[PDB]
């Protein structure tokens, strides 16, 4: 009974909307523009993970470092607790050692 008895409404996807059509343009901004702009400068998102990558612990550390002062009180408390828990997990638990 965990199965729907009717077909879901058809999902129409416009493969040629502007976003899809122009997707990827300027990905080669660096190599095709005398390296004035790095491709990572095209990344739009959280200030603490623009052109950067890491596991959850590194992401949380970077978030606290870069926007920790601007975080809300309980969000910052949760981030501190998450960093603490992730430190304990990655530095004290696991199959390999």
């Amino acid at each position: 009974i965990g199965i729907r008895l009717t077909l879901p409404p058809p999902k129409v996807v416009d493969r040629w909307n502007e976003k899809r059509a122009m997707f990827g343009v300027y990905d080669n901004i660096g190599i095709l523009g005398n390296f004035e702009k790095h491709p990572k400068e095209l990344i739009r998102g959280p200030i603490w993970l623009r052109g950067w990558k890491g596991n959850e612990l590194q992401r949380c550390i970077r978030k606290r470092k870069m926007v920790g002062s601007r975080m809300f009180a309980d969000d910052l408390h949760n981030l501190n607790k998450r960093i603490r828990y992730l430190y304990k997990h990655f530095n004290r638990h696991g199959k390999f050692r």
Binding site: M22, Y26, E36, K37
Partner: protein, 87 residues
Amino acid sequence: YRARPPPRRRPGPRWPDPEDLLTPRWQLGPRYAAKQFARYGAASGVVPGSLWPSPEQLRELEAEEREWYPSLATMQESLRVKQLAEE
């Protein structure tokens, strides 16, 4: 469609307003002005005279040099006395 204009570096020097509280401090010191001058020449608007140390800074630099970087004659004399003691 037509692509949006390609992203470009902001031309010329970038001078943040010191009054704004959100402007980072490193963007307000003399080092930022020196870098702007190096990057954009006279278009920076930075007075070149400011690049060199002010007399107080020069005095501090001279004091530090006297304190930590001895002259060649002093180094040679110290080496000579050390060698005499060792012999």
